[PDB]
Ligand binder design. Structure first.
Ligand code: ZW5
Length: 435
């Protein structure tokens, strides 16, 4: 596995022991062979769980999510997928790792796709080895893989709105359920309906994951309502998954705006990972998976793969060469390699808009490529009337850094900046010059 020029896909079924059993064995062998190694965790929560499996091994944890005193002699580093891509983009030295291990390698956020593209290109060049750990590699067509214990799979109509009757099976259950919804707003409505019915509900999404996931351990709960982020190594002690089988798809229209299309069907990989939350305990057969739609290849034309090309075009590899996407997911976007390569100063603005600005990659690219500097927010107010952002069904308004009240009407509209209350609040602060 560890020889140069090799990329191995470790595709043992969900719960088979890739993280807690196989990963320490790989790490021990890597250290014996003096291979400078990186381990990439999808989230801070998985990074903390990996420290538990790797305890006693010399690993440098490049995150505040792990409280350990390092020795300074570690040749194995562990960091998040997004941290890896971020450090590659910045004028910071990233070692040319001999062995690159990515856990939960199916993650489809732009920084994870870009990390796979960079790593697989270094392997193709003959410079490095890599191991991608996931039960569901790109292009998998099996939504029902093996499990540690038998699962009861049932196709059933799943509510996507509050209900008063006709879904008694949802609330008659006396165990713990993990319910995958397509968006934070949709989960808020289902959670309120379950709370009104006397259930204890925890809600998880990308921005709240670290804080709220700890509630699954510290308090008794009946339901967890989560977006797709829980497909990335989130472990629950549950006996049922309810799966809408739906997700939102960011889509770039006419190369000039991004909408959140759908809800539409999930891919087979996502459905398998959502089901994969249960059936993990061989002593508890009969966990239930209730699913409310079919699968489709909704990653084709999805904006994350175009955004991954924007990130890769701006990462140095060798002279003017540019890393390609990982071959099995490269047809998901139609893009010219190098078309998003920016000059030094525009690249710095692009990076800062993503890192400090917290803007989506596509939107950060429009601003930086227009020659606008990080702190110049005039573009948040000079778009067309059709770009007016709404708050409570009237135009949203902010006080600019000049002290003037203005309607929020960005030059480029990306639906992700106002898809829920928290996102709109963050974008209003950005438009006002507050970060
Ligand atoms: C123990 O070694 C490290 C710890 C933290 C960091 C910096 N972090 C990395 C993740 N994102 C913010 C800054 C680097 C390290 F080498």
């Amino acid at each position: 596995m560890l020889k140069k020029k090799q990329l191995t896909v470790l595709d043992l079924h969900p719960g088979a022991g890739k993280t807690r059993r196989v990963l320490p064995e790989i790490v021990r062998e890597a250290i014996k062979k003096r291979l400078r190694t990186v381990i990439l965790a999808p989230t801070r929560v998985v990074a903390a769980e990996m420290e538990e499996a790797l305890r006693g091994l010399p690993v440098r944890y490049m995150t505040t999510a792990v409280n350990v005193t390092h020795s300074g002699t570690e040749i194995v580093d562990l960091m998040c997928h997004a941290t890896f891509t971020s450090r590659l983009l910045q004028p910071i030295r990233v070692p040319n790792y001999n062995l690159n291990i990515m856990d939960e390698a199916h993650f489809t956020d732009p920084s994870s796709i870009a990390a796979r593209g960079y790593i697989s290109t270094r392997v193709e060049m003959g410079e490095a080895a890599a191991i991608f750990m996931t039960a569901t590699p790109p292009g998998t067509r099996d939504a029902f893989p093996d499990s540690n214990s038998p699962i009861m799979d049932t196709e059933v109509e799943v509510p996507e709105r509050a209900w008063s009757s006709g879904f008694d099976w949802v609330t008659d259950h006396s165990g713990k359920t993990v319910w995958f919804v397509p968006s934070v707003r949709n989960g808020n409505e289902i959670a309120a309906c379950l709370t009104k019915a006397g259930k204890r509900v925890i809600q998880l999404s990308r921005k709240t994951f670290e804080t709220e996931f700890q509630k699954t351990k510290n308090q008794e709960w009946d339901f967890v309502i989560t977006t797709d982020i829980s497909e990335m190594g989130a472990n629950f002690k549950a006996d049922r998954v309810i799966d809408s089988r739906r997700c939102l798809k960011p889509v770039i229209l006419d190369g000039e705006r991004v909408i959140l299309a759908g809800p539409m069907p999930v891919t087979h990989a996502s459905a398998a990972q959502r089901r994969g939350r249960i059936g993990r305990n061989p002593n508890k057969p009969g966990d239930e998976y209730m699913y409310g739609g079919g699968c489709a290849e909704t990653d084709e034309g999805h904006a994350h793969w175009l955004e991954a090309r924007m990130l890769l075009d701006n990462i140095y590899l060798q002279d003017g060469l540019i890393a390609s996407l990982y071959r099995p997911e490269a047809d998901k976007v139609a893009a010219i390699e190098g078309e998003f390569k920016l000059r030094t100063e525009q690249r710095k603005t692009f990076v800062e808009l993503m890192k400090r600005g917290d803007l989506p990659v596509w939107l950060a690219y429009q601003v930086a490529s227009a020659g606008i500097t990080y702190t110049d927010r005039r573009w948040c107010f000079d778009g067309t009337t059709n770009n007016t952002i709404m708050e409570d069904s009237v135009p949203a308004e902010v006080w600019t850094k000049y002290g003037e009240k203005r309607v929020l009407k960005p030059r480029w509209m990306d639906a992700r900046v106002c898809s829920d209350h928290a996102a709109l609040k963050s974008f209003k602060e950005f438009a006002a010059g507050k970060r």
